[PDB]
């Protein structure tokens, strides 16, 4: 069920990686420091890709209108975003990053 995304070392701190899933909406995996988080990639306010946004701490800023989300809770951090982002649990085992197959 879990999706093996990449090696933890494949991501530099403060970067975002888009994860495409055939037959499903893409996800965004964020590396904040040495921690990893995951959410749907599409901003809930439009069609922007959050993986192309700006990560400030644990808050992702959308590249389109400056809306923002806390990548840990998925809750909006800045307007105009109002709809919470879907969140996916992430697990790092033996240096490999895995993301839950289903939102939760």
């Amino acid at each position: 069920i879990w999706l093996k995304v990449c090696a933890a070392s494949d991501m530099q701190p403060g970067t975002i990686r888009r994860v495409n899933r055939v037959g499903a909406a893409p996800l965004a995996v964020y590396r904040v420091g040495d921690q990893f988080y995951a959410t749907e990639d599409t901003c809930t306010h439009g069609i922007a890709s959050l993986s192309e946004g700006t990560l400030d701490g644990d808050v992702i800023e959308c590249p389109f209108h400056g809306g923002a989300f806390n990548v840990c809770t998925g809750m909006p951090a800045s307007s105009p975003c109002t709809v919470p982002l879907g969140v996916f649990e992430v697990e790092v085992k033996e240096g490999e990053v895995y993301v839950a197959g289903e939102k939760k």
Binding site: A25, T44, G66, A68, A77, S78, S79, P80
Partner: protein, 389 residues
């Protein structure tokens, strides 16, 4: 929140929120039209608290959606396209919304769009009572309509008839003029005074202490918030007007005693009892449309026990009360409100006004409104709330 220069709000410590509420109070019910004005499947437009809204009647029930498409912000009403009984489709790119919950249920120009079912157009509760259409311009589950209506308006036997129109003045100037004990002077030559043989003083010389001039109601069985004008309980009615000791005017020495029970209630509705006749009551709202205008929603209520009395009342309303009172009496209130616009337009009148004794009633209202309103409508509510993490 933040509608007036901070320097001014800092000075009016007694009622800063009220002075800041130029656009009205959010999270309250407001009457905007009469039930007979909106028919089945015929959407109607209106602006309330600065927001453009659309109201429709479907299977007899009213629904209200914000008249602004989520997509490019155009008013859906520019070209109404209700393609199915339960929805409305934007004329631009066909984003379709359900009247029931505002959900974006379809997009004709792209049925595969990921936005379908992931967005919602703002909706507001709508309730009809006494032939009037009330809209809860607020967020979350609404409180009972009774909280925002004066006592007895919703009484089972109370027959309500009225008139509505748009007046060019901020809503607060309207409220204050209506609750102003001494403004009665502008009505001295009203046709109603002579034609309905009313006793009408020019004003009142206050008596007792200022605390006894009013009575604030901080809570009712339904959460009502208001103020009663008690200037007449210890005051001396002034019937003769004098200058330098000489009599230059006289009040009306009619036999009919009216308006000895006057109260103002949030969000801004006045109750005058009895008026314009000993067996009737007047309830009037000053509804904020935008910072410069309001709906002057007038209603006259009379208890009726049967259909025979209701029919009779209606006849009397159309032939006498509407033209003689609602128009013949209140028309002077309209230009009075308009006359106060300039002084308060730059927000400086809220600092420079020189009040006198009877204004204790207005001050009580300003404080009550400041302490118990359910929210300050801001321009950001109109364009879209903003917060930057």
């Amino acid at each position: 929140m933040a509608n007036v220069d901070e320097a001014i709000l800092k000075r009016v410590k007694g009622w800063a929120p009220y002075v800041d509420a130029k656009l009205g109070f959010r999270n309250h019910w407001y009457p905007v039209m009469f039930s007979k004005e909106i028919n089945e499947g015929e959407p109607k437009t209106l602006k309330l608290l600065g927001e453009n809204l659309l109201v429709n009647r479907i299977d007899g029930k009213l629904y209200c959606l914000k008249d602004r498409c989520l997509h490019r912000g155009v008013q859906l009403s520019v070209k109404v396209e209700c393609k199915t009984k339960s929805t409305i489709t934007c004329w631009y790119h066909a984003w379709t919304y359900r009247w029931e919950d505002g959900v974006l249920c379809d997009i004709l120009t792209n049925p595969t769009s990921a936005q379908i079912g992931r967005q919602k157009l703002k909706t507001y509760p709508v309730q009809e009572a006494k032939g009037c259409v009330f809209i809860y311009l607020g967020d979350g589950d609404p409180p009972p309509l009774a909280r925002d209506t004066p006592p007895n308006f919703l009484d089972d036997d109370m027959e309500i008839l009225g008139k509505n129109q748009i007046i060019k003045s901020n809503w607060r100037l309207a409220v204050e003029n209506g609750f102003d004990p001494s403004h009665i002077y502008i009505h001295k030559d009203s046709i109603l005074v002579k034609d309905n043989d009313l006793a009408l003083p020019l004003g009142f010389a206050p008596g007792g202490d200022r605390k006894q001039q009013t009575r604030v109601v901080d809570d009712d069985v339904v959460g009502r918030k208001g103020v009663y004008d008690l200037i007449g309980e210890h005051g001396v009615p002034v019937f003769e007007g004098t200058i330098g000791g000489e009599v230059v005017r006289e009040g009306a020495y009619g036999e009919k005693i009216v308006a000895n029970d006057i109260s103002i209630w949030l969000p801004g509705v006045l109750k005058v009892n009895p008026f314009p006749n000993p067996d009737m009551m007047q309830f009037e709202w000053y509804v904020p449309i935008d910072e410069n205008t309001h709906y002057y929603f007038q209603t006259l209520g009379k208890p009726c026990a049967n259909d025979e009395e209701r029919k009779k009342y209606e006849q009397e309303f159309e032939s006498k009360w509407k033209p003689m009172a609602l128009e013949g009496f209140n028309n002077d209130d309209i230009w009075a409100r308009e006359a106060m616009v300039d002084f308060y337009a730059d927000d400086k009148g809220w600092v420079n006004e020189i009040l006198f004794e009877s204004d204790e009633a207005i001050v009580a209202w300003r404080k009550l409104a400041s302490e118990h309103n359910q929210g300050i409508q801001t321009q950001a509510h109109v364009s879209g709330l903003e917060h930057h993490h």
